[PDB]
Amino acid sequence: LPKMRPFDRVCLDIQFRRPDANSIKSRLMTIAIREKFKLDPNVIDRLIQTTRGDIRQVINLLSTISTTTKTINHENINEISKAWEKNIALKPFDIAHKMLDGQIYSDIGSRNFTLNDKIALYFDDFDFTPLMIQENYLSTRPSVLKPGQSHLEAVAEAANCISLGDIVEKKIRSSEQLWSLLPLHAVLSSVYPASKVAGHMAGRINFTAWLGQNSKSAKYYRLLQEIHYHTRLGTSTDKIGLRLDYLPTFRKRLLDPFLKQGADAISSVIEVMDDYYLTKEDWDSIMEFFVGPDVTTAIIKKIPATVKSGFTRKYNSMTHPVAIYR
Amino acid sequence: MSLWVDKYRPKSLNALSHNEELTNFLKSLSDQPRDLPHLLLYGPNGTGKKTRCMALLESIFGPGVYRLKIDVRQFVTASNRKLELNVVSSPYHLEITPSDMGNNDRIVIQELLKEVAQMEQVDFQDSKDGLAHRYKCVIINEANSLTKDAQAALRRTMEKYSKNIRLIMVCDSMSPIIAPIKSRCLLIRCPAPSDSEISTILSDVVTNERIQLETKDILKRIAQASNGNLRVSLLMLESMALNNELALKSSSPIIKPDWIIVIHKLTRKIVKERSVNSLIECRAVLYDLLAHCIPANIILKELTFSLLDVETLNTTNKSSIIEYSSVFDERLSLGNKAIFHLEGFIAKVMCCLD
Amino acid sequence: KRSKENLPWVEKYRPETLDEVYGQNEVITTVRKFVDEGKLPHLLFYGPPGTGKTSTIVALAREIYGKNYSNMVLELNASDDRGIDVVRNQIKDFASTRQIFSKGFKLIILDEADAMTNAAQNALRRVIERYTKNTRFCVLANYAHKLTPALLSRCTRFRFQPLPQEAIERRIANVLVHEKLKLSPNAEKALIELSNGDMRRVLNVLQSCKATLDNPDEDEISDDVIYECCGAPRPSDLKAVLKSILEDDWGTAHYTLNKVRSAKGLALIDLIEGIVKILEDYELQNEETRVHLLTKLADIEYSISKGGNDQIQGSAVIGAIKASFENETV
Amino acid sequence: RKISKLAAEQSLAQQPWVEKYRPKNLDEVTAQDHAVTVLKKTLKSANLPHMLFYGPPGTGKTSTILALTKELYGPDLMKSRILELNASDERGISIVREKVKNFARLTVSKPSKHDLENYPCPPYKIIILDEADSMTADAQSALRRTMETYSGVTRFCLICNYVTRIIDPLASRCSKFRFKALDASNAIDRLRFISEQENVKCDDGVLERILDISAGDLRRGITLLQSASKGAQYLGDGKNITSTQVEELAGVVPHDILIEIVEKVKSGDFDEIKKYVNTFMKSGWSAASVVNQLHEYYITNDNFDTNFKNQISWLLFTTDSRLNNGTNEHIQLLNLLVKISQL
Amino acid sequence: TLSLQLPWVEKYRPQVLSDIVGNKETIDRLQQIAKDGNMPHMIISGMPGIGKTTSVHCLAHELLGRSYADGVLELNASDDRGIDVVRNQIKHFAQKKLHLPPGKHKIVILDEADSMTAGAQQALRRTMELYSNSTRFAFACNQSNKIIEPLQSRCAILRYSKLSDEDVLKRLLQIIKLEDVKYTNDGLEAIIFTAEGDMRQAINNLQSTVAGHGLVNADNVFKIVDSPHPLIVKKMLLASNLEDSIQILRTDLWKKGYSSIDIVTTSFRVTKNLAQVKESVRLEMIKEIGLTHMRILEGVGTYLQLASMLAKIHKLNN
DNA sequence: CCCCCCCCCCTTT
DNA sequence: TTAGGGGGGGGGA
DNA sequence: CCCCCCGGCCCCCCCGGC
DNA sequence: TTTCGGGGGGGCCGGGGGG
Ligand SMILES: Nc1ncnc2c1ncn2[C@@H]1O[C@H](COP(=O)(O)OP(=O)(O)OP(O)(O)=S)[C@@H](O)[C@H]1O
Ligand SMILES: Nc1ncnc2c1ncn2[C@@H]1O[C@H](COP(=O)(O)OP(=O)(O)OP(O)(O)=S)[C@@H](O)[C@H]1O
Ligand SMILES: Nc1ncnc2c1ncn2[C@@H]1O[C@H](COP(=O)(O)OP(=O)(O)OP(O)(O)=S)[C@@H](O)[C@H]1O
């Protein structure tokens, strides 16, 4: 859980796993003989399956059932298991695995696992289920393809439904707080596209990559805003225009000189920075924005260390202006 | 030093170099500025809208409008969050970009702007008429990025406090501006400069910078490649000059930005491969683009027009592509997560082509 | 607050006794029988706006307790705090304590209970159950889906219907007698038609009509007065527009629509609603015609709800009607 | 330093024409008599109902309510008898339950002898909720019983552009007043009065063209007239204002450009249409204006059959609806033109 | 009139475990537990009005007897049940000394436990574990999923099924004999049909019908109890001709005063539960219904929108 | 003893 | 029908 | 004159469908 | 992630009362 993050690597972690039927069978048989009720060993594996490895729950079940039924055998195991089944909410990986299984979308499967059950499965975690589905709906081998329908066409239909679900989600989290739309979202974001591409997972199930990408975009936008308001006094544009238009020319007038004149260009670069109130951190951030062929990481690492050291020394050996006086 | 796009930016109405009719209209507006209504300047990006706004302010108040200072204002949400807004100010005007706080832009309109609106002018700012100015000008950049709530908040503030402030909004498109706000403003169309005007401006920059040119056709090529974006044209001229040792030849290639090259590569990949795995790699490319501050609407427009320029596609494919682009642009307007809609558009295009 | 004549008609004519509530005869008879024999259960009045729910419950409280019912009942509505804390303290204390004035039972009126939080509704369950020996609850609502199943399980449900023609006619006659007004039969029919079963609309429109007359003591309210005050289309205008759409060419239909709207500045939405009402009665040979009509007109209404270009919307209405009715031939 | 305070008349004189010529009394409201007469009768009947003004932009709702409050109370008593809240204020459910309710339950401010002698002074106060369509449904629901319970000392006036945003109970409680769109026929008198007051010289039909272009918004028409007057004054020639100048100031596409677009569409070549539209967008024309002009051209053209008009009407409606959502003008316009070309 | 007749749901509330109908096996288990004591921690779950609170109270009374006033602590959603309450009042009750017969324990009855906060539930764990030698806990709820898994581990699960028409008829006949109510078979059939397995609802409707009309027949029952609108909505959605569906919508729902939001929500629920239609068709229907629901929430709640929704559903079904 | 069977549990803000 | 891969632990040639 | 009890804001975290 | 609103739980602050 997120709340456990502070305990990352401070304590010796010891994991206790669900004990199997064999490790406990003697205990339950001893309890049965002491308590004077008949228990068939062949059903113990079932009983644990009912309790999901909860020994305390197993003992409670035995105590409650023995009050009226003194013999536990195959003639009554099914009803006891169904009545005492532990219904725990699934986790995002399990939710994704279940929702994308084709069997539940067949006539018999849909009759056994109903649409209401699928909506409830979504509601096990309504925040993460749509992200899981959008992450893993292209990684399946479908078994629900309609005649004459390619995998690509079903993927396109699912993507359209996911876009509609995103619109509904925006509606829910607006100022009107239309939480009553949550069930509809469940259908549009998760159930419908899954029914369109349900089948067998082709590879491993992956956790949603949208959250990390969103955080990275937020960080880059913050850096871009800082750069923009450092250079506001000199430029005429918005931050988007700064990213799309100014930044390549700033790359040519800030990074290229080091790769051509070595240390002799340091002054010029600093001059440009002083003309736009840019700092060393702004320089690095600017170099961090470029994509595609203009990636700078390898180029920057290839620069001689002496040139960078001299650049830092020269920048620290002078006085610089301030665009924003706090 | 200072980039040529900034060093040679005009600082007065008489220094403007294109769209003479618009210059005359602005001069007519500045002739009797006391009863100036609220203004809304709309037109293609990078044409000179902000330059003309600053020139109009200079004509009204004087050169002091260019003495800009940056300050930071503090705001508190209902959840106790602390937000900071950068305000550019001069002795005569204020400038704000409320979209900087996203959904909290409304607060800026409801607290800061109103506070400015409820203040009368007592400083003796003597004007050409002989009397002191009675209102301060507030510029709202990217006015079309405001949420509907902030626009609604602007409405009565514009009318009640007209004697104290005058608003100048600047946008690249009026589609996202609500009807009441457009009704409350004087709309000014700012057309892009022609190719010849761009060539003249670039030639003046070249002569003032002592750059060798094999001919005047390179400037025309840059103007055509800019598609009417003067800022882009000037930046591209500077980039080419830097890349060719301050000497441009007739064979000097036109430079393109990183994101444009990436989007063109994505278009080629989409055209050549139409498969689910291709869609996965396209998702990776889209994530890379979005992460580095490329707006989703820009990506959609660029990809659509790149696809429409592919010579191997037929009329039916292009019609389907433009229809899907329309639908998914609407989806982007009403959605939260842009990647969902971009992926949907790419999947539909792949289906239509295949 | 200088006199009752200073009140709006919607409040000046609020029923004070169960005999002044019209159009809900079954509910009134049943509740009166309940009170007469001392068999009042927990009540749930469900119905659309302006049908008489609040009026009926207030009149019932007055009948049970008399003129001083206000100090003998606990009335809470959407303008008051009704969180779980209020349920835990104020409602619980009122339900568990004797009356200050008399020895009778206690009445709690939760008006607009559909605006109450789920937690408060859940907390109400055991309060209702435990103190049923001496306390009764009444819940009023327009939207039943906001009420928890547990609360509905504990209440006897009465549905308030949209007001029938006869009840509106009788109340209009009473108001005309009180106000010394004259009303034409056609104007009365138009008023009933625009009422849609809501008495508040009838009263407001009648007050506006009286304000419109130059000499209300001698001038009679004609259908023209109603259409002028409400700014609504006449049936003849709707018939002409529909006939032009279904019979003439595009130029004539466009001209007729624009002329009809400009004559009195009618709203396009009112024309759309009137034409929809007319078309519901039309017998169509093909179901596809009805499908297209309904879908396209619903889309147009939704678009209008957000504004947009009025002329384009009118042309869209014309085109949708023509295209839909082209399906009646083959 | 400090500046001597300006007089109200002098201040209003140097205000924008829309604010300068805002109606000061109910007699100055131009073409809303069907409601203004009912409101005026309240000066004597003193039984003002709860009001729901609804209509398109710039039709006179706010002006009407302000003039009504002035006429009812007077410049001395208005402030004490009015509580105004608009979209620039906080109007959450808590605000409705506490501040609005507290003001509604207060005893009315005491009129002075002069106020009683010179104004009707009805025995109630007024709460104005301007831009009420921005309020949430729960906050609106919090007003229901407050309106009815304190109606003896308080009356509510809700003003909106989209009446569907008002929940059904509130619309039921309020008497509805629909403000009609202001066009040439019903607003030319007021526009001509303003032009004469400002000594604006224009060709015959210029005011009618301005009101046609405004499309039901008198505020827009007055602003356009002021801009044209400024242009004429700066030119300093004495020539009358022409319709061409008004159209250029209003962002209307010239007819020749529209004909070029029509010919390109008639050609049907996708690449040529795309190239022409790319060149066209550089002029900065508003897509909504282009769509409106195309609708006008095609619908009233006698050279197109019924089926073509039936299809193009739906195409134009769809494009306009999409544009209303804040979409990219270039993409929407290109899609519309391509779709028309294939009809 | 200032007098009240005690409701029959309270007058004939079962006082012993033998008077509760339905869920026979669980009731016998409770009877045996009450016989021999040794009551464990238990969680009783089920739908409204089936006898969960009645079962718990009867068990507690039969177990404790004269010591009921001292050995029972009852808390429900109408009482304060925060973490502070769990840590102080419940803990003091569990620690308290009370002499009880050799096979009896103190009982804490947490009715409507699904509304309890997660913090209080967490605090209850070790209190249950440490004081189990003298105190036992009985939870009653409608949704057992709201009870955290650690608490479910320590308790015995008792899921109450819905009452069959036969048990409801038996209880209604008992009450009728006790009250000498005059009825007809059709009246009882209508009462059971409208009750939908809710004994409280059935008894309330019976009493209301008797009070308002005397004779419990079909006509009086339907006059007092309205036909559930979900069935009308199902008939509307299952109609073959668009005209029939529109007629049902206009005459049975819109003219009766049912709100558009209620109609659309009920349509969504019924479509979700329509096991007779193929799941994919149900998904398309739900998409259309959700479009209409979003439009209605936006403020455009009109008969035209619902008619358009029905037209789209019929177009899908054809 | 390493190998295998068999299962459970982690991928995850 | 078992998503891939790692950990645990009883059985055993 | 100083210390302690206990009511009230104030802040911060967490659901939100059936 | 997060755009209102409700609910809960814990931390200080300060009035009043007592010694
Ligand atoms: N049955 C009725 N008989 C007479 N007048 C009625 C009737 N129903 C409504 N009215 C009139 O409309 C006004 C409001 O009636 P209410 O009883 O408040 O309606 P309502 O059902 O409570 O409205 P909601 O549910 O709060 S929107 C009354 O003061 C009456 O003047
Ligand atoms: N009926 C009218 N009569 C005279 N002037 C009008 C009229 N309507 C609008 N105007 C003019 O336009 C200006 C604005 O009028 P408003 O009353 O603010 O319109 P509005 O309907 O309240 O606009 P919205 O709904 O806030 S966009 C007025 O000051 C007048 O100068
Ligand atoms: N099995 C039953 N046998 C006899 N009467 C019942 C039975 N179930 C409910 N009732 C009657 O309905 C009344 C209410 O029963 P309850 O035990 O309160 O139902 P409940 O399940 O606890 O309701 P919830 O879950 O709090 S909404 C009882 O007093 C009985 O009169």
Ligand SMILES: Nc1nc2c(ncn2[C@@H]2O[C@H](COP(=O)(O)OP(=O)(O)O)[C@@H](O)[C@H]2O)c(=O)[nH]1
């Ligand atoms: N020489 C000259 N340059 C101009 C003119 N107008 C704009 N520019 C240049 O174009 C650049 C971009 O102008 P800008 O106002 O920021 O674009 P916009 O606000 O997005 O429309 C400016 O930095 C100027 O250098 C002009 O009239 N003359």
Ligand SMILES: [Mg+2]
């Ligand atoms: Mg009411």
Ligand SMILES: [Mg+2]
């Ligand atoms: Mg207004």
Ligand SMILES: [Mg+2]
């Ligand atoms: Mg219960």
